[PDB]
């Protein structure tokens, strides 16, 4: 396993056709998971499954600029389950990040941060056992 929180460097940032794959297992009684694609201190893409927000499960996505969070985008399709292994694939496309979980499309998030080649770290945190984090150009 990998130690959480985990930092995955993204050398030279991201670019369309870059596929980032995160493998892990959600802990029992999980509350949250976060994948934070960072441009320095800014968070270009916060992908944030929440397991118990007012007794609902929801995926929250957002961006943080100059330490301020923006307007969330929410997705109630929720493919994670406490205790179960998952695969998150984030495919950078020209206008959005495209996310699939366990080989099923989940959501897209349009690029708010434009300097893709400066989004040079992925932070992985929350209630998981992290098995691997890697990327490949497809
Ligand atoms: O303080 C809040 O209102 C929230 O703080 C966390 O959420 C932050 C951020 O405020 C939010 O815009 C973003 O989408 O997700 C962030 C995060 O850390 O996940 C709490 O998670 C949230 O429940 C609110 O309390």
Radius of gyration: 14 Å
- Give the overall form: globular
Question: Structural class, please?
Answer: mainly beta
The number of distinct structural domains comes to 1
Oligomer: monomer
* Main sheet: strands, sense, barrel: 7 strands, antiparallel
**What is the H/E order?**
EEEEEEEEEEEE
User: Ligands bound here?
Assistant: a molecule of 2 linked components (GTR-ADA)
Beta content: over 45%
Number of helix segments? 0
Strand tally, please?
12
Summarize it.
With 138 residues, the chain is mainly β. It has no helices and 12 strands.
Describe what you observe in this structure:
By secondary structure, this protein is an all-beta fold. It has one domain (1-138). The protein is 0% helix and 61% strand. It contains no helices and twelve strands. The chain has strands at residues 6-9, 18-26, 33-39, 42-53, 56-65, 68-69, 73-75, 85-92, 96-101, 104-110, 121-126, 128-137. Strands 1, 3, 4, 5, 6, 7 and 11 form a seven-stranded antiparallel beta sheet that branches. A hairpin with a 2-residue loop joins strand 4 (42-53) and strand 5. The protein is globular, with a radius of gyration of 14 Å. The protein starts with 5 loop residues before the first strand and ends with a strand. Bound molecules: a molecule of 2 linked components (GTR-ADA). Residues 34, 46, 48, 60, 62, 69, 72 line the site of a molecule of 2 linked components (GTR-ADA). GO terms for molecular function: carbohydrate binding; chemoattractant activity; disaccharide binding; IgE binding; laminin binding; molecular condensate scaffold activity; protein phosphatase binding; protein phosphatase inhibitor activity. A motif (Nuclear export signal) lies at residues 114-129. Its main location: cytoplasm. A beta-D-galactoside binds at residues 69-75. It is found in: Cytoplasm; Nucleus; Secreted.
């Amino acid at each position: 396993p990998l130690i959480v929180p985990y930092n995955l460097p993204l050398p030279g940032g991201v670019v369309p056709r870059m596929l980032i794959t995160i493998l892990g297992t959600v802990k029992p009684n999980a509350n949250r998971i976060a994948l934070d694609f960072q441009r320095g201190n800014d968070v270009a893409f916060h992908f944030n499954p929440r397991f118990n927000e007012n007794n609902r499960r929801v995926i929250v996505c957002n961006t943080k600029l100059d330490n301020n969070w923006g307007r969330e985008e929410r997705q109630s399709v929720f493919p994670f389950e406490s205790g179960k292994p998952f695969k998150i694939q984030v495919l950078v496309e020209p206008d959005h990040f495209k996310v699939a979980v366990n080989d099923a499309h989940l959501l897209q998030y349009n690029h708010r941060v434009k300097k893709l080649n400066e989004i040079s770290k992925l932070g992985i945190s929350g209630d998981i056992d992290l098995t691997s984090a890697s990327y490949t150009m497809i």
